[PDB]
Design a protein around this ligand. Structure first.
Ligand SMILES: C#CCNC(=O)[C@H](CNC(=O)[C@H](CNC(=O)CNC(=O)c1cccc(O)c1O)NC(=O)c1cccc(O)c1O)NC(=O)c1cccc(O)c1O
Ligand SMILES: [Fe+3]
Length: 705
């Protein structure tokens, strides 16, 4: 009997991307590009402001990217938690899917809804687990190189070069190492000129930036030592560095002179260092796994403001870099025990402990002189430091009820040192109706701890009125340590026909989303003192939005037209996404997304690929920061559109393949006009918040032994 962990990787809410899929749709740089084509996955911001809108990240079933937990070889990636979380729920972050280089990935696992809740904190949407190629019984290695070439030159081209080498040292000692260097160029500063929202006053000439660029350096070493036939001990260290290439991005799309000085410059750099020890054992009466991970993330970037329009724009009064540091510590143990009597079943016991320490000398520095002081909050020299610790125990049991039929109950208990106890129960069922048809169902309660910015009372944003809910008076936004965790009851009912390479399936999912954390709507208090008409500014906190809901359909259809010819489709359809308190939308996703590949292995040494992605309509948020129906261009929608691509790979030998193709064959292009709503002298842009890149040719070479 399979463990509950391996078994639940067979739910309809589960997708696998292989190393061979990566070869046939090679990503520019970030893996999000290919990860997003799975059913139930979008590439979206975290809320609906449209801020930092070219910085979109992986979203599972509309639940936001903060609810997508990224693992590498089963170990958490937490680095984006080192970037400032803004009034509107975005971070100036490119996300956490670009730390492992695409050509060293063996496979990617995407686990959605109820089969993912067992992973705990931050899996309310789901889990994406990036697995790296590993050593075997013989020295192996590869060299992979990529390059694209956009028709339009303003758009940023990507150059990417990686190697891997792996194999034996001793009989009982293996190594696996890789190194990657990559560069996606920034879009030209001016790429959105003519598409920018209307720009009055002093904001005349300001521009929504295109896509930011990134320089990557990744180096990983792994050493695998066989103590015994029954025990293995693995040591690994990782060093990654991303530095951007800045092209005019600012939270509000306003500008100043520091912005313009910095065009082309590196204005943020993220160093990520990972060390890990892993014990793995296969035994007489089961197996077991224990690991320790230390992740240290240094986020160095230029000081930005924290008030109204100055929020998220470089500040000339505090010019220069600062460094936020994230130390994240993760320990994990589990034993797997096959039990034979009664039913065939496999029981799994485990605990987990995590600590997140965050040092950030910049985000807590807003002073209170204009809006009046806030009892209990020092105006200067507040602490940089946050932390939270979670302890967790769990038990999952995968019970063969009769052959065909599997029932897999679990319980996880989580103790957060500030927020308290959480109980996440789960039930995952698969039953076989035929050699060909399988019914599956799942219900779990997933868990999300407040992030360290939401939770901190020293974290303080300010606006003179334009961001304030329900008024034009000055207001403050303040963290809250009395917050409850977000929980979500992720239901799924799904059915699948599968036979002779022919697959046809359709899943319904509903996630009932309790206590989503968001900026509050009522002032809890008022500050006293200050200057002029801004004196005695309102005080709001980060609050738990009591109930929200997402709902949709995942579908997939795969037919073998002939021996050498396969037609595949992944389908996402978003039925509902609602803050039930404000009736506004949680996330801006396309109404549907259909991904379609035709794969012809026309020859033994030649495969050809055609792809079509159809995106549906996209609607912006209906309400502004004040909470009032928006007006003008702020209502603009994106009409449905499709991106098509052709590509191929030619086997020159066993040891060498060429690849080449075209993304966006019909040069369908979109442009970021700004943010979804209007501010003073800056007309809204509704759903037009991102740059879709135009026709782009690409080539590739892979040599391997
Ligand atoms: C040029 C120009 C546009 N200028 C303004 O809109 C001025 C003066 N402020 C500024 O120009 C910049 C830049 N302003 C902009 O680029 C346009 N505003 C925004 O994008 C904005 C977005 C969300 C919330 C806000 O409060 C915003 O001002 N903002 C600030 O210096 C500022 C500092 C502390 C507190 C604030 O609220 C500030 O606005 N502020 C106001 O008119 C204002 C009036 C009521 C409420 C506000 O929030 C205002 O900013
Ligand atoms: Fe303002």
């Amino acid at each position: 009997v399979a463990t509950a962990q391996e078994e639940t990787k067979q739910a309809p809410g589960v997708s696998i991307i292989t190393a061979e899929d990566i070869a046939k749709r090679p990503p520019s740089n970030d893996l999000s590009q290919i990860i997003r084509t799975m059913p139930g996955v979008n590439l979206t911001g975290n809320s609906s402001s449209g801020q930092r809108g070219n910085n979109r990240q992986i979203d599972i079933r509309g639940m936001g990217p903060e609810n997508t937990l990224i693992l590498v070889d089963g170990k958490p990636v937490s680095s984006r938690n080192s970037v400032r979380y803004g009034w509107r729920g975005e971070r100036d972050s490119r996300g956490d899917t670009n730390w492992v280089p695409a050509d060293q990935v063996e496979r990617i696992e995407v686990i959605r809804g109820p089969a993912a809740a067992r992973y705990g904190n931050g899996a309310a949407g789901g889990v994406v687990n990036i697995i790296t190629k590993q050593a075997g019984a013989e020295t192996h290695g590869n060299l992979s190189v990529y390059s694209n070439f956009p028709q339009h030159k303003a758009e940023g081209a990507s150059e990417r070069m990686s190697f891997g080498l792996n194999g034996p040292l001793t009989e009982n000692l293996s190594y696996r190492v890789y190194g990657n260097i990559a560069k996606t160029d920034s879009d030209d500063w001016d790429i959105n000129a003519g598409h920018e929202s209307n720009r009055t006053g002093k904001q005349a000439g300001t521009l929504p930036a295109g896509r930011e660029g990134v320089r990557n350096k990744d180096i990983d070493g792994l050493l695998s030592w066989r103590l015994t036939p029954e025990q293995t001990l693995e040591f690994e260290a990782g060093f990654s560095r991303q530095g951007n290439i800045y092209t005019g991005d600012t939270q509000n799309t306003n500008s100043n002179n520091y912005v313009k000085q910095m065009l082309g410059h590196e204005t943020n750099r993220m160093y990520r260092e990972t060390y890990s020890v892993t014990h793995r054992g296969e035994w007489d009466f089961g197996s077991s796994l224990a690991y320790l991970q230390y992740e240290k993330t240094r986020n160095s970037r230029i000081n930005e403001g924290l008030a109204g329009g100055t929020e998220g724009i470089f500040d000339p009064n505090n010019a220069g870099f600062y460094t936020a540091t994230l130390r994240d510590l993760t320990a994990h143990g589990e034993v797997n025990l096959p039990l034979h009597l009664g039913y065939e079943q496999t029981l799994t016991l485990g605990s987990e402990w995590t600590e997140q320490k965050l040092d950030d000398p910049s985000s807590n520095t807003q002073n209170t002189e204009e809006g009046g002081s806030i009892p209990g909050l020092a105006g200067k020299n507040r602490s940089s430091s946050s932390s939270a610790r979670i302890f967790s125990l769990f038990a999952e049991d995968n019970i063969e009820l009769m052959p065909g039929t599997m029932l897999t109950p679990g319980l996880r208990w989580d103790h957060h040192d500030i927020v308290g106890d959480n109980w996440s129960p789960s039930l995952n069922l698969s039953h076989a109706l035929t050699e060909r048809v399988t019914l599956k169902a799942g219900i779990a309660r997933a868990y999300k701890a407040p992030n360290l910015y939401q939770l901190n009372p020293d974290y303080l944003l300010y606006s003179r009125g334009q961001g304030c809910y329900g008024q034009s008076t000055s207001c403050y936004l303040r963290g809250n340590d009395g917050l409850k965790a977000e929980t979500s009851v992720n239901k799924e009912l799904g059915i699948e026909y599968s036979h002779d390479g022919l697959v046809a399936g359709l899943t319904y999912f509903r996630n009932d989303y309790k206590n989503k954390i968001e900026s509050g709507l009522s002032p809890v208090d008022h500050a006293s003192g200050g200057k002029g008409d801004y004196a005695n500014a309102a005080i709001y906190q980060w609050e738990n939005v009591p109930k929200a809901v997402v709902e949709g359909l995942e579908g997939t259809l795969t037919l073998p037209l002939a021996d050498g010819l396969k037609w595949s489709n992944n389908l996402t359809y978003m039925l509902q996404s609602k803050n039930k308190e404000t009736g506004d939308v949680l996330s801006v996703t396309p109404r549907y997304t259909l991904n379609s590949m035709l794969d012809w292995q026309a020859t033994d040494d030649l495969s050809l690929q055609a792809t079509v992605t159809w995106y549906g309509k996209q609607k912006p948020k209906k309400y502004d920061y004040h909470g009032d129906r928006v007006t003008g261009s702020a209502n603009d929608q994106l009409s449905p559109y499709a991106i098509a691509g052709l590509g191929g790979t030619y086997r020159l030998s066993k040891n060498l393949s060429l690849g080449a193709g075209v993304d966006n064959l019909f040069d369908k292009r979109l442009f970021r006009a700004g943010n979804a709503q209007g501010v003073v002298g800056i007309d809204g842009a509704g759903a037009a918040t991102y740059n879709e890149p135009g026709r782009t040719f690409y080539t590739s070479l892979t040599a391997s032994f």
